[PDB]
Design a protein around this ligand. Structure first.
Ligand code: NA
Lengths: 11, 288
């Protein structure tokens, strides 16, 4: 639910 | 009097994918608001060719949903107008881009599941993409530098693992050779050339965002560390202007930076020199 690298939330 | 060269920064991410095209005057400390992107996007890549700024790949990560972009879009600083161009063979979130000889190289990035090792060349004169020799490794969040008319592709994420491996494309022979791996694993680092050296700054090692910076000497084929950056940052914008490196924003596991640091090679020192109007990660950056 978070991308540790970009900081983008997904789902 | 008149206005000189500018660090353009395009799209990015904070709560959602963004449309912001802004520019920084390094010699006046000032920031320009310019025409928004037709479509918002994040983890795109920026480059200039023949005066014109190009916005390649990325994804629109919306409240609604999200789409990976195959889009190439062109900003004319004369007209303050974006125009669309031939899309790529495939969508490329977290793309790497380099320019050799008026031609744009799109390397790696993701179309959802598919982590790419494909690579495509775009010719502005024709407005046409062409597939070329794929890389040895699949790589997204890949740093990309053009040194002595070669394209170096540095670190990234192969779908399973974060890489410290780096390879080298030969445009004339159409083939890829692996090169000395970096000391550090680095996904979504910032990479560029300066005084004849590839620099890799920041990135995610797989545990922690980094502020370490190492450079490649192509002759001695080794990765020496230099001065770290003040702030830890992954998914940062990078460019060279007036023989100094600028790093623009990114993520540090807690907050979306608005910091921009500047590295003097001559004195092996960093220094923070402005903030961006907002904090954002996965912007694309270029100078003209
Ligand atoms: Na931006």
């Amino acid at each position: 639910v978070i991308n540790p690298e970009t900081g983008e939330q997904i789902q | 009097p008149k206005v000189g060269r500018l660090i353009y920064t395009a799209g990015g991410y904070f709560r959602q994918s963004l449309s912001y095209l802004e520019a920084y005057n390094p010699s006046d400390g000032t920031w320009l608001r310019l025409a928004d992107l037709q479509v918002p996007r994040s983890g795109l890549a920026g480059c200039v060719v023949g005066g014109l700024l190009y916005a390649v790949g990325g994804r629109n990560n919306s409240p609604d949903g999200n789409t990976d972009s195959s889009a190439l879009d062109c900003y004319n600083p004369m007209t303050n107008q974006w125009s669309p161009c031939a899309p790529m063979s495939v969508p490329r979130n977290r793309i790497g881009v380099g320019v050799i000889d008026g031609h744009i190289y799109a390397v790696g990035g993701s179309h959802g599941c598919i982590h790419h090792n494909s690579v495509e060349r775009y010719e502005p004169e024709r407005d046409e993409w062409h597939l070329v020799a794929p890389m040895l490794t699949r790589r997204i969040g890949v740093g990309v530098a053009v040194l002595n008319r070669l394209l170096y592709a540095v670190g990234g994420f192969d779908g399973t693992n974060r890489l410290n491996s780096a390879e080298c494309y030969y445009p004339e022979r159409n083939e890829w050779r692996m090169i000395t791996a970096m000391n550090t694993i680095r996904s979504g680092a910032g990479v560029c050339v300066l005084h004849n050296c590839i620099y890799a700054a920041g990135g995610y090692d797989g545990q922690d965002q980094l502020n370490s910076v190492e450079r490649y000497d192509v002759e001695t084929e080794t990765w020496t560390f230099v001065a770290p950056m003040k702030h830890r940052r992954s998914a940062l914008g990078i460019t060279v202007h007036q023989g100094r490196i600028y790093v623009l924003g990114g993520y540090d596991g807690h907050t979306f930076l608005d910091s921009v640091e500047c590295y003097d090679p001559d004195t092996d020192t960093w220094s923070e020199v402005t903030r961006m109007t907002s904090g954002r990660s996965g912007v694309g950056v270029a100078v003209t």
